[PDB]
Amino acid sequence: TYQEFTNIDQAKAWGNAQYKKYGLSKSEKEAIVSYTKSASEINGKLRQNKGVINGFPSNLIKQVELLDKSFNKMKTPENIMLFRGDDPAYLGTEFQNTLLNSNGTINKTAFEKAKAKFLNKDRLEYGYISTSLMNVSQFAGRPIITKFKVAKGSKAGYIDPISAFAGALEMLLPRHSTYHIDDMRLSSDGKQIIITATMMG
């Protein structure tokens, strides 16, 4: 079973308890802060280079390597569910402008195609993955919610306290992670795709 927080006070308490135990260095803390300030831009370069950072500038390599190594200290003590919201382009360029009907519902034919493309497949993310312990307004309007099943002992860091650029209840996952898409469904009001995926390392 995977713990899914349904109360924000419990979630915050649990995350803070993990954060206080990490024993991060000054330089690791600084690398995480720098990452939150440049997250979208850094993840793009990781994607273009397919995770190869050798060609990056010296200072950027050091930041990325510190961040990578900081995950040695940031592991979840239990099976946990993490949440992420995404826009249509997450499913591919072919879905960017076709996933939705004008009335705000997911187009059911596009959904069928998305399910055929991704269901029971593994996906590799070159960037780091930002998630949250709960879906509590920070993914408002996003048509795709992913629920990641993250096993006890997995690399995952509660960084909500570290920086003003960290998201609410943010759990950051390491770069170059692979997850398996277990299930894809529509929400009861037809306005979201809900994806369940099992995180690998």
Which sequence positions are flagged as catalytic?
84, 130, 170
Q: How many CA atoms lie within 13 A of 48 on its CB side?
A: 9
Q: CA-to-CA distance for 144 and 141, rounded, in angstroms?
A: 9
CA 49 to chain CA centroid, nearest Å: 19
Residue with tokens 């390599």: 61
Burial label, 142 (beta-carbon count in 10 A; 0-12, 13-18, 19+):
middle
CA 199 to chain CA centroid, nearest Å: 10
Of 163, 171, 184, 139, the residue nearest 18 (C-alpha) = 171
- At 191 the three-state DSSP class reads coil
Integer angstrom CA distances of residue 201 from 75, 127, 183: 12, 13, 19
